[PDB]
Every structure is written in C-alpha cells, then in structure tokens.
C-alpha cells in the first residue's frame, strides 16, 4: 500500500513535468517560427 501511493504519485509527477516541458517546447517553437517570419519579411523589405 505504501508503495502504491508512491507509485501513483510518481506516475502523476511524470505527466506533471511532461506537460510543462510540452508547453515550453511548443511556445518556444512558435517563438522561433515568428522570428523566422519576421526575418524573411525584413530580408525582403531590405531590398
């Protein structure tokens, strides 16, 4: 029983940190996407 509380807690903490990492990689991916769009636009605007 003692291990079972610990076991479910570990399985839940795995998802808890995984969701944070998924959000962070997704938002940083969108950030680089926006940066690439801005860079292409400014490259075209330069010439």
């Amino acid at each position: 029983e003692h291990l079972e509380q610990e076991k479910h807690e570990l399985r839940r903490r795995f998802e808890n940190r995984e969701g944070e990492w998924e959000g962070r990689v997704s938002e940083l991916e969108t950030d680089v996407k926006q940066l690439q769009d801005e860079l292409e636009r400014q490259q075209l605007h330069l010439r």
Binding site: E15, N16, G19, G23
Partner: protein, 276 residues
C-alpha cells in the same frame, strides 16, 4: 515547551505540505484548461509567489533553531550537572532569552533584519559557550592522571562530544585511550588463548562447588562481557560512528571476530548430547 513547539510546527508543516500538493493538483487542472482554451489567453506567464512562503521559510527557522538550542540545552543540563558550569548554563539561558525577545512571527523587512541580528548574536554567544566548554575539556588532562579517570570523564560528558566544535578539540586523548583499549583487548586475547582447563579460573571454580561445564561457559561469558565493555569504551571515546573510524575499524573487526569465538552454544549442546 519544546515538545509542544514541535507539535505546533508539525501541524504548520502539514498545512504547508497540503498547500503544495493541492496547488500542484490545481496547477495540473489549470494547465489542462489553458491547453484547451489556449486561443483565449495570449499571456503564458505562469509564475506565482504565494505570500506565505516568506512565512514558511521564517517558520522553519524557528523549527531548526529551537532544536539546535534544545539539543544543546538539555545536554548542558545533564553533563554539566565548578563556576564554569553555572556560567555556561546562565549564558545559554541569556542567549535564548535575547533571541526570544525579537518578534519571531514578524515577516517584513524589520522582522527579517531583527531576526538575522538576534541569530547572529546567539551564534557568537554559543560559539563562546563552546570555548568555555573546551576549557573544561583541557582541565580533563589538567586533573585526570590515570586512564580510568580520563575515560570516566569521557563517558560522563559523552553527549557533549556530539557537538561539532567540541569533537575536534579532543584528538590527542583519543589516540592514547584507543591505544590503551587495544592493550586491554590484547590482554583479553591472551587470557582466552590460555585454554580453560589450564586456567586458574577452572581450578578455583572447582573449589567453589561450581561444575566444570558451567565453569567453562561462565568463563567465556565473562570474557564476552568484558569485550562488550571495552567496545563500549571505544564507542564513548570516539563518539558515534566509531565502527568506521580510522582506529575504530580495526577495533570493531577484531572485536567481532573474537566475539564470534567466545560463543558457548557448542559446549552446551555437547553437554546435553552426552547426558542424554
């Protein structure tokens, strides 16, 4: 009192742990919602600093503090049970009162700085109490002439040696006493090497109407008792962790291997088999 303080502290830390766990569960839920309703909120800021954390650390400082006082104070009530003894006791009490004056539950900048100043004052005062105690540690050799008196001073003040600054002060007496104890257990080895039927104990035990098998078992049991006493002497001398000390390791290994052969179960079993 310290026990009641500990009860209150564990209740408060239960409260904080419940905050942490339940806030984690809620955070999971709100993260799921933000995933579902991501288009409705452009802001991804997620950092919140709960107001009570500033208290939670502060409260912990009393829990760590009073323990470090109580573990000292009770010991100074036992081992120091000399003008230096009463001076140390009253100095510790004065230091605790001085820290006690500051409003501990104050949490703002004023409370923080007052707490830091009071703890610094108490730390320097206790460091001075430890020097006033090392003075008696030197008066140990100042008075004791023989090994037994010095060991008894070691055993009476054994709890006081658990302190970190106290342990390093006494290093020259530790080597001398461990060498003396090694000599003692060597003498015990010499006594046990001389087998029981040749020993004087066998004859004199036969004189006093003691039967022979019981005599052998009793002899071995006393040698075992003395080995236990000497190992306890080493434990007092070197404090906790003497099993893995530089000079305590050989002591422990030899003592264990010797006690393995002081067992008398075979003698009793052989006697029972013969009589049956």
């Amino acid at each position: 009192a310290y026990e009641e303080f500990e009860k209150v502290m564990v209740a408060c830390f239960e409260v904080f742990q419940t905050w942490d766990d339940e806030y984690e569960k809620l955070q999971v839920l709100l993260r799921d919602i933000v995933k579902r309703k991501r288009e409705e909120n452009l802001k991804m800021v997620w950092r919140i600093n709960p107001a009570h954390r500033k208290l939670q650390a502060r409260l912990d400082q009393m829990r760590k503090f009073r323990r470090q006082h109580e573990q000292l104070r009770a010991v100074i009530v036992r081992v120091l049970r000399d003008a230096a003894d009463a001076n140390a006791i009253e100095e510790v009490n004065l230091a605790y009162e001085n820290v006690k004056e500051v409003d501990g539950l104050d949490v703002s900048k004023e409370g923080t700085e007052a707490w830091e100043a009071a703890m610094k004052r108490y730390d320097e005062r206790i460091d001075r109490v430890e020097t006033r105690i090392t003075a008696r540690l030197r008066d140990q050799l100042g008075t004791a002439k023989n090994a037994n008196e010095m060991f008894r001073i070691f055993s009476r003040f054994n709890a006081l040696f658990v302190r970190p600054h106290i342990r390093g002060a006494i290093r020259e007496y530790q080597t001398q006493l461990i060498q003396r104890v090694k000599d003692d257990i060597e003498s015990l080895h010499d006594k046990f090497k001389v087998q029981y039927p040749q020993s004087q104990a066998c004859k004199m035990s036969h004189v006093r109407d003691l039967p022979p098998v019981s005599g052998s078992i009793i002899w071995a049991k006393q040698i075992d008792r003395q080995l236990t006493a000497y190992m306890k002497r080493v434990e007092d001398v070197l404090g906790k962790g003497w099993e893995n000390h530089v000079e305590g390791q050989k002591l422990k290994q030899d003592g264990d291997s010797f006690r393995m052969k002081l067992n008398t179960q075979e003698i009793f079993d052989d006697w029972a088999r013969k009589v049956q």
